[PDB]
């Protein structure tokens, strides 16, 4: 079993174990796959409200794998959830990236990964 | 461990075990939560491009809890992962609502739970 939340309201990150088997883990939100597998990344990144943004910037959130965009998304300042199923490397760094980080939210803002277990079963 | 996977492809459910403790799930994408606990609720909807949109309804996403609105979830036609993390009770049923069908790439479109673990371990 192994998953780390990731809260930037605290620059911390919550933990199934002492020291993960599956990942390390900075105190920025970044991530270092230490166990190749199939992972859910997951969060929810909050805006701030967009009558407090006064320019034309959008709101955009990407995620990357090492220089790798992994996805890109963009609303119009609503909660983002993030993330969904990737086949991840031994050595990947997963990081997120924002057109602006003044966009962003702290509270409530989170994100990070667990390892999935497999699912060979089918109904 | 417990998870379960709808591919909206095929209308399977993928899953940890033969029998998964934590959800009853059917074939028409819907599930219900068996066991108490913190669950991340996951998936991406897929849009089909706009040159293909012959209605005039907008890109929404919804997830119910019983008969109340979990999440709403709407961008301009693109990538939409959905869900977070999320307390919730045995017997609640979980499904997604879209605005229309025709909307939806089936193929690349998915959600599911997973029942969580603990997080204790915090820096």
Do not use: R
Request: aromatic share 12%; net charge positive.
């Amino acid at each position: 079993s192994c998953m780390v939340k990731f809260e930037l309201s605290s620059s911390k990150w919550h933990m199934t174990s002492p020291k993960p088997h599956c990942v390390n883990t900075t105190s920025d939100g970044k991530l270092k796959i230490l166990q190749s597998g199939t992972y859910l990344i997951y969060g929810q990144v909050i805006p701030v409200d967009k009558k407090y943004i006064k320019d034309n910037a959008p709101f955009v959130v990407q995620i990357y794998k090492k220089n790798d965009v992994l996805q890109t998304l963009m609303n119009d300042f609503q909660i983002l959830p993030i993330g969904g199923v990737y086949e991840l490397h031994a050595g990947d760094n997963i990081y997120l990236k924002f057109n602006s980080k003044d966009h962003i939210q702290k509270t409530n803002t989170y994100w990070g990964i667990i390892l999935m277990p497999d699912l060979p079963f089918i109904s």
